Design a binder for this molecule. Structure first.
Ligand SMILES: *[C@@H]1O[C@H](CO)[C@@H](O[C@@H]2O[C@H](CO)[C@@H](O[C@@H]3O[C@H](CO)[C@@H](O)[C@H](O[C@H]4O[C@H](CO)[C@@H](O)[C@H](O)[C@@H]4O)[C@@H]3O)[C@H](O)[C@H]2NC(C)=O)[C@H](O)[C@H]1NC(C)=O
Ligand SMILES: *[C@@H]1O[C@H](CO)[C@@H](O[C@@H]2O[C@H](CO)[C@@H](O[C@@H]3O[C@H](CO)[C@@H](O)[C@H](O[C@H]4O[C@H](CO)[C@@H](O)[C@H](O)[C@@H]4O)[C@@H]3O)[C@H](O)[C@H]2NC(C)=O)[C@H](O)[C@H]1NC(C)=O
Ligand SMILES: O=C(O)CC[C@H](NP(=O)(O)OC[C@H](NC(=O)CC[C@H](NC(=O)c1ccc(F)cc1)C(=O)O)C(=O)O)C(=O)O
Ligand SMILES: O=C(O)CC[C@H](NP(=O)(O)OC[C@H](NC(=O)CC[C@H](NC(=O)c1ccc(F)cc1)C(=O)O)C(=O)O)C(=O)O
Ligand SMILES: *[C@@H]1O[C@H](CO)[C@@H](O[C@@H]2O[C@H](CO)[C@@H](O)[C@H](O)[C@H]2NC(C)=O)[C@H](O)[C@H]1NC(C)=O
Ligand SMILES: *[C@@H]1O[C@H](CO)[C@@H](O[C@@H]2O[C@H](CO)[C@@H](O)[C@H](O)[C@H]2NC(C)=O)[C@H](O)[C@H]1NC(C)=O
Ligand SMILES: *[C@@H]1O[C@H](CO)[C@@H](O[C@@H]2O[C@H](CO)[C@@H](O)[C@H](O)[C@H]2NC(C)=O)[C@H](O)[C@H]1NC(C)=O
Ligand SMILES: *[C@@H]1O[C@H](CO)[C@@H](O[C@@H]2O[C@H](CO)[C@@H](O)[C@H](O)[C@H]2NC(C)=O)[C@H](O)[C@H]1NC(C)=O
Ligand SMILES: *[C@@H]1O[C@H](CO)[C@@H](O[C@@H]2O[C@H](CO)[C@@H](O)[C@H](O)[C@H]2NC(C)=O)[C@H](O)[C@H]1NC(C)=O
Ligand SMILES: *[C@@H]1O[C@H](CO)[C@@H](O[C@@H]2O[C@H](CO)[C@@H](O)[C@H](O)[C@H]2NC(C)=O)[C@H](O)[C@H]1NC(C)=O
Ligand SMILES: *[C@@H]1O[C@H](CO)[C@@H](O)[C@H](O)[C@H]1NC(C)=O
Ligand SMILES: *[C@@H]1O[C@H](CO)[C@@H](O)[C@H](O)[C@H]1NC(C)=O
Ligand SMILES: *[C@@H]1O[C@H](CO)[C@@H](O)[C@H](O)[C@H]1NC(C)=O
Ligand SMILES: *[C@@H]1O[C@H](CO)[C@@H](O)[C@H](O)[C@H]1NC(C)=O
Ligand SMILES: *[C@@H]1O[C@H](CO)[C@@H](O)[C@H](O)[C@H]1NC(C)=O
Ligand SMILES: *[C@@H]1O[C@H](CO)[C@@H](O)[C@H](O)[C@H]1NC(C)=O
Ligand SMILES: [Ca+2]
Ligand SMILES: [Ca+2]
Ligand SMILES: [Cl-]
Ligand SMILES: [Cl-]
Ligand SMILES: [Zn+2]
Ligand SMILES: [Zn+2]
Ligand SMILES: [Zn+2]
Ligand SMILES: [Zn+2]
Lengths: 692, 692
């Protein structure tokens, strides 16, 4: 039989291992010749595997690279202008890679050029609340200072936006051992910890879903009209550069001025973590100097797009996509994901070669330039937005398969909760001590839902990965899954975006048997299989009704911290609760009808209602000043692109509202957002009513 | 048999006559009790006629009314402040209506209040080119002057926008006999001409598709958050008032200053048509004073929505909609249209009562507050936009059935050209001298296409009617048809929006036999019938390919008036011509496939490609500063809401480009628009490619 079990059984840990090794021997930086060659290889193999068509879709997008003959670095300069200490020019390469060419040195992608000199201020994680604490509570002024912040907690682009709005003239990012060195584990190569010379690369854009900075709204094709640099979307206006903690210590050890406000501001280095500004007594005349010479350049990128045509509904697309470009070797990020996609394609192809086809079309994507701002997936979705809008059933992301070896992590639309629960009950747990138990069982035990007994935690989608265009711009039901760490015992993974994130890191320390990779392949592949093959789309609209109520209760509780203003400005959540109640009632009736109907037009009608339900949460006017975040229930946090926020329109209207100069205007905008949310929930509910 | 012929044969001229009489005995002004009562009557009758459901959909929208106890008027005031001449307070009512209550006096809906006093400048039709001529060529400054303009040529809202941007402090609109008095025909009641005391009412908003000024994007429901007046969309900032030509003569006869630039500026009154500013010698100290006291008020409106559920595809909607509100009696506008819709519903219902259902759902709409800015259709489409976007097959408008008795007029998407041709060849001509000939024959003979031998003229859709939200905002294939005048022998209809536009006007002068009404009922009803019942949607994508080429040639010829700048700024139309060539090739292949396939999923796939093809021309970012005009091929002219413009993005970028201060920036924006148009045409073409 050709059923999901046949598909799942064909997936092999040994194949994922071989593919991962294959994908991680050399760097695959976006826009480079090596990454184009890997694109061509993936295309060729996907064709051999049996896909109906496999094409490259190329775009010319703004990328960023260091200048090879004018290296980036930071100095402490004495009163005379002598540079008395310099940060590293590169990470010491790991054993056996000391002769590998084309390792890009650590840098912050899209930093402007400059050589600012100044006094340091230490801003903790550079979060919104860290700047509140500095400016409002400590009365420390960041204007014209060079800010030093530790990586962690939030997306690095938000840190740089926050620093820039505080008036900083430069940003130094570093990895503190408190955040990137797990106690009792050794540094790479002897363990999975970040060494002192290790450095996290990464872009520092604030794109808000725009894709290529130069062509928001439209694909960056051959005849595209491009914004000039000064009108580009999301570029930082001050120089930024990342360093490791050996170098950070040399910069922090001399800091004077004010003490850290509390222990939450202290990392693990043997330094005071003084906020500054500037150095203590002796060194008060020394300054910090940045030297940034990176350039932005329009460069060609290549997505690989594979099609497996549906037998019955070829005009319905289930998409499995993840990126292929990496900062260096991409041992985890993204090749642990791409190797899994590769094995999934291979498995679907084996079934295809025996005469099977899925009911719906499956599209497989190897995205380029994800690391530079989700550029490849976004440009391709901008090009194909009409096909995706009208035919897109679901998008399953497939970046890093592991960030730990403890339990499953799933973030997805509520429309997929029931699918994920059912699938994981049919899969074997790979965990020690759960031999013969289901993945659902081990996952639920290790990661209990905070509100429901005997269910596992599933999180809302945030952003900072390639599902962003599909979910928050286009409103296509999206999901992701990976193996993760135990959050209780250790508060991503230490070697992220460093030269040390290699094949050996994975094979030795994370997943020697490749069983977690195999489990992730089964979850991601199984979800695709069911989405593409189940006669009735496997979405349960009632799960959306339940979370909408949770989110409404939550946003109302935020507003209720201001009872006087709610009285004064007549702020009522009644319409939103009413819309949510209506959604609950209508969804329940629709579920009954879905149970109670071989009439293929009736079937296609109801599948279209399921498919367009995610779509109904899209507001074509977008969220305030973020036109590409159109989903009214979920957006990336305005303070942290990685985290999802619910009812983001209302949330942002309420945020720090007690500081607004014009409360009448500010509360008017809260009310406007409540109306938009209530209306959108009611409109989505009505897509599930009888159609006539 | 229950076929189109059964439907068409059931339509009766006598019924349309009876309905028109019924709908025109009293005024039905939007927001008034009489118009709510008529809404309830239509609802009750549509239910009796056999529709499955008939509901009222109500909204609370900004309307505008004169103050009953503080009448609007215009004066000439002498040096002392004595008002020596006053314009009329009302139109002399026609015979037998001299005791009818609640005739709203002439006014310009949404004028602000004010009493500006000043010197007159005569600005012809107040078109963009009329102001160019005044300011650039004659060096006449409109700043702080009261502008007087004749109605005609363009939508009155554009006149007021133009006057306002020229610095006018008030606008007087009048009906010149040159435009509203056909030679050799008598004034009402003895003929169909405008008397000297006759006055055209009408709104002077510049909404650009927004709907209710206070709630753009969202329906004006019970909990809607409303803009304050100062942020409302589209409201004029200077007082405006309309007058008839007896009153206009008293205002024009004294004008001094400069002579009219040429004969195209002279109407038919026995006055010089001097441009001003101000009066000649003797009267140079007299001024014109307006007294406007109208108020804007949020008022409830009611659409009637009737459903006839489809037997096979109930989740596909063909919409027949037209408005019900009128300025006064609405003898032509809109009741000649609403009476036809009424008879069409009655006919479809007779077939339904014998056990027939259309294949697809038909929705029937009686829209309210059309005269105040398309408010009822737009608010209902904003409320239901997700259902319309995903399920809307087509929208057929049904306002005034006649504006003349000469031949047919059709404006529609190219997707309906073939449908209209085929249908009119099956209908009998009602014209004298074409007894026994088809409507196609008489129409083609009287209104030949300017580029194709033996075809009739069909125009592109403009705006200024209720299809605007469906076509230019949502991208639903739309069409309209009516009987019209001979444009050659006479350069709308004279009694438009006047108290004299009555049942007797129609019955005596336009259509005593109601045969033109019956022909229009057959065209509009037949189109609905075919759209709702044909197994394959009756759209021919190849007709779009042909007009796209015409429009591309046209826009390229506009740009080619500036060959030097095209060389300098490297402006190429190559991408647009390439996209159009691709659309032509892909559409031709799709048509072959459509010929060459009882597999109902294959059928539904290809009908979805037909249905979503209009949708593919929508750009979700909208046109520059007009977010609700989203169709990239067609928008209402920025200079005349009634007229459609093709490739409006490029057209507006090229318009008057030789006057822009920064040619580099201006030509950059032309290039940007060419890229958007090329991309959108190519994207639409690709929706017709094989889906996988
Ligand atoms: C959730 O679903 C329910 C349907 O089960 C839906 O209920 C609707 O609520 C609206 C808005 O509150 C009701 O609107 C009323 O309609 C009647 C006519 O049917 C009017 O007469 C009412 O207006 C008068 O009263 C108002 C309230 O004080 C006054 O402000 C106004 O000036 C008038 O005097 C009013 O418009 C509507 O009838 C129901 N529909 C039903 C019960 O079928 C509800 O709105 C949905 N929730 C959301 C957020 O959409
Ligand atoms: C209409 O349909 C046709 C398909 O029949 C489609 O043709 C495409 O045109 C594009 C854009 O011109 C071609 O793009 C090229 O692709 C190759 C790879 O296949 C590249 O090597 C080319 O890039 C090089 O050359 C460029 C041109 O000088 C340089 O600027 C560039 O730097 C590179 O050196 C180039 O990107 C594409 O291959 C075809 N596709 C085909 C023939 O299948 C056309 O674009 C459609 N029209 C519109 C408006 O979409
Ligand atoms: O440009 C973008 O939007 C993102 C590009 C790029 N995405 P990518 O590196 O492939 O993946 C980001 C992300 N992975 C991570 O490890 C993020 C970094 C890690 N932080 C987290 O995992 C994190 C996650 C959620 C959260 F709410 C707060 C923090 C850290 O800061 O060290 C993911 O797996 O989705 C990046 O984050 O630089
Ligand atoms: O607010 C709006 O957008 C329009 C509200 C309202 N629409 P409505 O009066 O029912 O119909 C407008 C229009 N009818 C007309 O007669 C328009 C007026 C007539 N002009 C035209 O017919 C005209 C038509 C096309 C054109 F390119 C230039 C002029 C005139 O100026 O006397 C139509 O039948 O679609 C109005 O125009 O006041
Ligand atoms: C990764 O695997 C691929 C495919 O096995 C290797 O590329 C092939 O190398 C073979 C034999 O050495 C050539 O004959 C083919 O032309 C290549 N096939 C392709 C591109 O599809 C590739 O060398 C491997 N890379 C590494 C670093 O191990
Ligand atoms: C840090 O690096 C800088 C730049 O390479 C060093 O300063 C340079 O040294 C050379 C040779 O001594 C001089 O000719 C250049 O003029 C210097 N450049 C600048 C910009 O000052 C510096 O010595 C290094 N510091 C340490 C501690 O290694
Ligand atoms: C997940 O599995 C549950 C349990 O089988 C499914 O719920 C059942 O669906 C069947 C088939 O329609 C019904 O007859 C049962 O009454 C359902 N049982 C319940 C609700 O306890 C559920 O449909 C699956 N979810 C999917 C496939 O998304
Ligand atoms: C227009 O026609 C309608 C329907 O025939 C008339 O309204 C009805 O009047 C009858 C008998 O006079 C009443 O008993 C009904 O209650 C009404 N029916 C409705 C509202 O559906 C209406 O009077 C006519 N109006 C004019 C001006 O002729
Ligand atoms: C035009 O109308 C105005 C206003 O009704 C007339 O002027 C008013 O006349 C009354 C009685 O003579 C005075 O008490 C008011 O003070 C006047 N009002 C204003 C605003 O001036 C005027 O006479 C009329 N002109 C003509 C020619 O009929
Ligand atoms: C309008 O009528 C023409 C002539 O009948 C239709 O074109 C024919 O369609 C049939 C049925 O598929 C084909 O077999 C013929 O070859 C077509 N004749 C032609 C192109 O000359 C056309 O389809 C109709 N248009 C509609 C229904 O929108
Ligand atoms: C890199 O720096 C060198 C050496 O100082 C310089 O000549 C060159 O312009 C730079 N390359 C760039 C900016 O691409
Ligand atoms: C910080 O200091 C600078 C002086 O260089 C001044 O311009 C700015 O207003 C100060 N900002 C705050 C928030 O105190
Ligand atoms: C793998 O699992 C073991 C057992 O819990 C743990 O001690 C080790 O830290 C894990 N490895 C990684 C990289 O998390
Ligand atoms: C109408 O004018 C009267 C009489 O002068 C005035 O009292 C009233 O306020 C006005 N009504 C309005 C503005 O609605
Ligand atoms: C017209 O006249 C006014 C003086 O009241 C002046 O402010 C304005 O600049 C003039 N405009 C033009 C275009 O000449
Ligand atoms: C009706 O048709 C006749 C014959 O051409 C024409 O003379 C008359 O003007 C028409 N009536 C109207 C209102 O156009
Ligand atoms: Ca883009
Ligand atoms: Ca609205
Ligand atoms: Cl992922
Ligand atoms: Cl019409
Ligand atoms: Zn990454
Ligand atoms: Zn990644
Ligand atoms: Zn009208
Ligand atoms: Zn009308």
């Amino acid at each position: 039989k050709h059923n999901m079990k046949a598909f799942l059984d064909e997936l092999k840990a040994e194949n994922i291992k071989k593919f991962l090794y294959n994908f991680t021997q050399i760097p695959h930086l976006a826009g480079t010749e090596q990454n184009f060659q890997l694109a061509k290889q993936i295309q060729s193999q996907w064709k051999e595997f049996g896909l109906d068509s496999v094409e490259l879709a190329h775009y010319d997008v703004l990328l960023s690279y260091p200048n090879k003959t004018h290296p980036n670095y930071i100095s402490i300069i004495n009163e005379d202008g002598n540079e008395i200490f310099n940060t590293s020019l590169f990470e010491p390469p790991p054993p056996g890679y000391e002769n590998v060419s084309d390792i890009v040195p650590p840098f912050s992608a899209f930093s402007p050029q400059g050589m600012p000199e100044g006094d340091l201020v230490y801003v903790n994680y550079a979060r919104t609340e860290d700047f509140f604490k500095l400016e409002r509570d400590m009365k420390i002024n960041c204007s014209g200072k060079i800010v030093i912040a530790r990586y962690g907690k939030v997306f690095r682009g938000n840190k740089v936006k926050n620093a820039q709005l505080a008036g900083a003239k430069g940003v130094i990012l570093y990895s503190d051992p408190a955040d990137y060195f797990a106690p009792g584990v050794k540094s790479y190569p002897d363990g999975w910890n970040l060494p002192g010379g290790g450095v996290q690369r990464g872009n520092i854009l604030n794109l808000n879903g725009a894709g290529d900075p130069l062509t928001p709204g439209y694909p960056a094709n051959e005849y595209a009209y491009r914004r000039g640099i000064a009108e580009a979307v999301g570029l930082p206006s001050i120089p930024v550069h990342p360093i490791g903690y050996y170098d950070a210590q040399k910069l922090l050890e001399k800091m004077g001025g004010s003490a850290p406000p509390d222990s939450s501001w202290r990392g693990s280095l043997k330094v005071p973590y003084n906020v500054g500004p500037g150095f203590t007594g002796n060194f008060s005349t020394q300054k910090v100097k940045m030297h940034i010479h990176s350039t932005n350049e329009v460069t060609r990128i290549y997505n690989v797009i594979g099609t497996l045509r549906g037998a019955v509904e070829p005009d319905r697309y289930v998409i499995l996509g993840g990126h292929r470009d990496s900062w260096v070797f991409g041992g985890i990020d993204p090749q642990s994901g791409a190797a899994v996609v590769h094995e999934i394609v291979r498995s679907f192809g084996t079934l295809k070669k025996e005469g099977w086809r899925p009911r719906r079309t499956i599209l497989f994507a190897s995205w380029d330039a994800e690391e530079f701002g989700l550029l490849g997936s976004t440009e391709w979705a901008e090009e194909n937005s009409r096909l995706l809008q009208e035919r897109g059933v679901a998008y399953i992301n497939a970046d890093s398969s592991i960030e730990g070896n403890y339990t499953l992590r799933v973030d997805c639309t509520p429309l997929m909760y029931s699918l994920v629960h059912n699938l994981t009950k049919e899969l074997k747990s790979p965990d020690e001590g759960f031999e013969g138990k289901s993945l659902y069982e081990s996952w639920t035990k290790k990661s209990p839902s905070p509100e429901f007994s005997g269910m596992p935690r599933i999180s809302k989608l945030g952003s900072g990965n390639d599902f962003e265009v599909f979910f928050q711009r286009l409103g296509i039901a999206s999901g992701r899954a990976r193996y993760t760490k135990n959050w209780e015992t250790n508060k991503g993974y230490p070697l992220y975006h460093s030269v040390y994130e290699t094949y050996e890191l994975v094979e030795k320390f994370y997943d020697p048997m490749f069983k977690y990779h195999l489990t992730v392949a089964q979850v991601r592949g199984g979800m695709v299989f069911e989405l593409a093959n189940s006669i009735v789309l496997p979405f349960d609209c009632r799960d959306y009704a339940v979370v909408l109520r949770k989110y409404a209760d939550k946003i109302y509780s935020i507003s209720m911290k201001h009872p006087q203003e709610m009285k004064t400005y007549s702020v009522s959540f009644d319409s939103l609760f009413s819309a949510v109640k209506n959604f609950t009632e209508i969804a329940s009736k629709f579920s009954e009808r879905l149970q109670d109907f071989s009439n293929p037009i009736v079937l296609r009608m109801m599948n279209d209602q399921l498919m367009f339900l995610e779509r109904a949460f899209i507001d074509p006017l977008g969220l305030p000043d973020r036109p590409f975040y159109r989903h009214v229930i979920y957006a990336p946090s305005s303070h942290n692109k990685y985290a999802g926020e619910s009812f983001p329109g209302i949330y942002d209207a309420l945020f720090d509202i007690e500081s607004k100069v014009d409360p009448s205007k500010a509360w008017g905008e809260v009310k406007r957002q409540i109306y938009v949310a209530a209306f959108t929930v009611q409109a989505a509910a009505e897509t599930l009513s009888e159609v006539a």
